[PDB]
Design a protein around this ligand. Structure first.
Ligand code: NA
Ligand code: NA
Ligand code: NA
Ligand code: NA
Ligand code: NA
Ligand code: NA
Lengths: 90, 90, 90, 90
């Protein structure tokens, strides 16, 4: 489960990194950053400048938001929770 | 279900596209982009410039956020999940 | 329930409108808009300029986000759902 | 539970405050504000300027979003709910 969500999230972010670096001309790190804050809805960056970028972003959000949050709802629920919970046992 | 959420989300986005292109003077694609990132809470754009735009946006958010996320919670839960899940079966 | 969430959300937004119009010097409509997009996490505006504004915003988010989304999870779940659901009955 | 989420959220915010004040050169209050609106996804600020800042932010979001919202889902569910609910009893 967690491993699958791990991989699925990775592929989605790889696609975004490749897309934004190419179409929006961003350095890879900036393309990855944009992909991450966009799918997590933080969105603390300017929007894409090209229409291709805007269209892809619309589809990217609808298809990737569900997956990203599913992974987050496990990275802290089935991994970080025990670490803290089980440790709260004297 | 999914088909209904599909249509309901479409109508909501069509209304936003028409509104922002008219009142905020945005090109249709930009009006659609604003509608999408606003309802998904990504919000990586400047805010509306007119008071009419601000008021509509407030109401648009309250009425559309629930629907948009309901659709997302199906586009990946009752469509993308199987595709990946059932495929994880050797 | 819905009526209570309705009122509770109203009071929270009234407080934000009063605060931002006074401390950040915003016109009431802009103060209301900021309060709304902040609590719904859309956040498509610049941040507060004063430290008082930043501190209040931090507390406002933690205390208001839960309520706002609770109301949204009813404005479309116990009001908009039937309207569309029951109507989907030939 | 609530007390644990309280503390866990505090530590996460302390780390962010220390990181952004040092690496992004922000005044402590601004570093705390950035940490808060980033993890709650409000994101109404410009993005980090350094690559170190961008990388940390990516990891910070994935590891902190789950915790922050878990705490919020209690600050209003197991603390603010009763205060209002039990009080709605004539
Ligand atoms: Na959000
Ligand atoms: Na956001
Ligand atoms: Na945002
Ligand atoms: Na934003
Ligand atoms: Na933003
Ligand atoms: Na912004």
């Amino acid at each position: 489960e967690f491993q699958v969500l791990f991989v699925l999230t990775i592929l989605t972010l790889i696609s975004g990194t490749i897309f934004y670096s190419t179409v929006e001309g961003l350095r890879p790190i900036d393309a990855l950053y944009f992909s991450v804050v966009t799918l997590t809805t933080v969105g603390n960056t300017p929007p894409p400048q090209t229409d291709f970028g805007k269209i892809f972003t619309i589809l990217y959000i609808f298809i990737g938001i569900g997956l990203v949050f599913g992974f987050i709802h496990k990275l802290a629920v089935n991994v970080q929770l025990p670490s803290i919970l089980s440790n709260l046992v004297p």
